[PDB]
Amino acid sequence: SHSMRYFFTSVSRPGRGEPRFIAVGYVDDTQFVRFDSDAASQRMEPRAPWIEQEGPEYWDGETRKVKAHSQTHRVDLGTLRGYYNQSEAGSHTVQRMYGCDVGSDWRFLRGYHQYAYDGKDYIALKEDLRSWTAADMAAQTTKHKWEAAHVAEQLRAYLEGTCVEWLRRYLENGKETLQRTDAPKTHMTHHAVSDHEATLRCWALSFYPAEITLTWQRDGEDQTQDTELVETRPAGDGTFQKWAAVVVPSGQEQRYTCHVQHEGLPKPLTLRWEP
Amino acid sequence: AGVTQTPKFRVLKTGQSMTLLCAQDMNHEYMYWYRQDPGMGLRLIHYSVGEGTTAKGEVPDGYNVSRLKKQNFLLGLESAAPSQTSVYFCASSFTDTQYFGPGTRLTVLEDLKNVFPPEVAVFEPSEAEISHTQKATLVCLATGFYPDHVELSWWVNGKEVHSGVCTDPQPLKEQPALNDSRYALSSRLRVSATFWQDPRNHFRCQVQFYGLSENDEWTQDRAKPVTQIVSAEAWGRA
Amino acid sequence: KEVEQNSGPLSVPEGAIASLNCTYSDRGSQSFFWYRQYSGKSPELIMSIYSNGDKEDGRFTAQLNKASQYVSLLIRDSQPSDSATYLCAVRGTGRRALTFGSGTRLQVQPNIQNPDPAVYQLRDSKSSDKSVCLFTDFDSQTNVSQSKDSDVYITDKCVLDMRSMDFKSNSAVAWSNKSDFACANAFNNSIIPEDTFFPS
C-alpha cells in the first residue's frame, strides 16, 4: 500500500512579525518537498532527487498553492483567537494534515483532512468523506460554514481524484527509491542489570519502509506485558531503526526469542541469544 | 442583503473621480471587482483575499481598490477616461463560488451637452388585431435618450406587470453613423381584447432615465437632463 | 485565451438539448463553474463541478473532462426562458480568483403551434398622426432584418409570454417620420411569410 501526506504548521509569534509557516510533503516515509516562510527562497523546495525532474510549471504551481495556504492560515490564527477569546500576546499553533492512501493496485483506499489547534483536535473530515467531526463549539462554527459552502464535495474531488493521480505519478517517477524495500539488519545485545537478571535488546537497523513489528516470546508466548519498545527512529540516510528489550533471569536467556516482521522479509525472523 | 453595489448608474466628465462601493453581509474573505464590455465578457480588475490585502486582476490599470474593512471592497477611479465606460460587477465568495452584485453602469463623456432624457409615447392596439386574434398589444417607444441609462417597466392599474411584456434587450442608435447618436427602445404589453376594452383599466409605460445629478454643472438653455421618470399612458376603451 | 467559449449565438428549438462548451489552458485547475446572465442582469451560478464526470441539477447537466481540458453544460428540454448568455469560469492552479470566458449567447426559439403572421398599425394614445407598425404572430422560422432604409427604425424580434394563457408570440416594431413610410412597406428589407395578414 502507499500514501501521500502534506503536514502544515502555522505558529503565531507575538511582536516578531508574520507567523511561522512550515509545509512538508511525504510519499510513504520519504519526504519529497518543503516550504519554510523563514527561508530565503520563498519557494516550494525539493527534498528527494526524483521530484527535481519536475519542470517550472510544477514548481511555480506548488509554490503558489503553498503560499496561498500560508495566507489562509495567517487569517485562521486570527479567527481562532476570536472563537476562543484569546489575545495576540500568546503564541498559538494551527496544525493541518491531508492526503490519500492507495492499495497494492494503486486504487483509492481513503482520504484525510484534519486540523489541530494548540495540540488538540479541531475539525476532521470523517472517513466517509461527506461529513465533519468538530471536536468543540468553536469547531462547530467552522463545521456549519463548511456544510453551507459544500466544502466536502470539492475536498472529496481532490482526495479521491487529484491526490491519487499525484501519488501514482510520484510512485512511477521515484520508483527506484519509493517502490524499494530495505529488509532489517538484526542483532541482539546482552547487559547484566543485577547478578540475578539481564536485558536482551533486539535491534532492527537500516530498514525501509518504517512499518515493522518486534515481539519477544518466552517459551513461544508473547511477552508484550514486559517488553520495552522504543519509537521507530530515522537513521538520517532514508532508513529506520528500532529496538525491543526484555529483562530475563541470568542463565535463562535462551528461553527468549525476538520476532521481526517487515515488508522486506519473505519470512518473519527469529533471533535467540548466542554466547 | 447579499452583495450590494452603489451607485447603480453614473455619468462622469473625462477627468472626474469616483468610488464604487461593494458591500456583503456574508462574512466572506474573498471579494472581486470586474468590468464587462461586449466582445470581452467579464474581466477581473482587482480582488482581495481578506481585510487589508488586495491583488491585481487581469485589467488593473487606471483603477485602485481598498479593503480597510472585511464587509466592503472599494473601487477608485482617480481620473475617468472614455475607455472606463463599462458595467462594473463586484462579487464575494466564502470559497470559490462567487455571488455577484447588481452592477454599476458608468458612462464617461468629454462633454455632458450630449446627455438627453427619453421622450415616451404609448401606441394603442389596432381594431384589426383585436378582431383577428382576440388580443390587444400596446407598444411603448422611448426615443432621443443619451446615454443608454434606461429601465422601462409597464404598470396596469398602478401595479408593475411582467407577464405579456417584451422589451428590446438593447436600444437602436437613431443615427448609426454618429459616435454620440441618441437611442430608441421599444416594448410591447399584450393583454386579452376584453381587458383592453374595459375603460376602468389604466396602462402606463414608465421609463426611469439615469442622467446628471443635482450637483452637476449645467450652462444650456434647455432643462438639465437629470435622473427622472418619463411616462406615457392609455385607458382601456370599447 | 485561458478560458475559451464560442460567442454563438447558439439557436435551438424549444425542447431540444442546448450544449454549451468550454476549454481551459491550466491543466491543474480544480474548480469549474457555469453562470447564467440575462440581458442587463447579474451573473447567477447555475452549476459548479470539481470531479471528472457528470453532475445533474434539474434540467442542467455539467460534464468535466480534465484529460481533454473540456467542460460542458447541457440544458435538457430547453425553454424560451433559458435564452441568456452562459459564462464558463475556471480557477487555475494556486489561483484565488475565477477566470471567466466571454460567454455563449443561447436563443431558445418558442414553438409557435398556430402561426398568424400579421402587420398591424397602432396609433399614439396622445392624439397625433404618429403611429408604429407591429409585425407579430409569425413562427420562429421568420427572421426580421434591420432597416434597408435610414429614417426607418426596426427592432429585432422579441418573445412575449402571456403566462396565464400559456401563449408565446414573436413581434418586431417599425416606425419612421417620412410620408412614404407605410406598414405595407415597413418589413420589406426582410422575407415575411407568404400568407401575412395585411389590414388597412
Binding site: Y6, A23, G25, Y58, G61, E62, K65, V66, A68, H69, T72, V75, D76, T79, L80, Y83, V94, Y98, H113, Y115, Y122, I123, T142, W146, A149, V151, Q154, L155, Y158, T162, C163, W166 | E29, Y30, S93, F94, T95, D96 | G28, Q30, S31, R91, T93, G94, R95, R96
Partner: peptide
Amino acid sequence: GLYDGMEHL
C-alpha cells in the same frame, strides 16, 4: 501535489 482549497476556519 497540493490541494487548492480556499476554505478558512
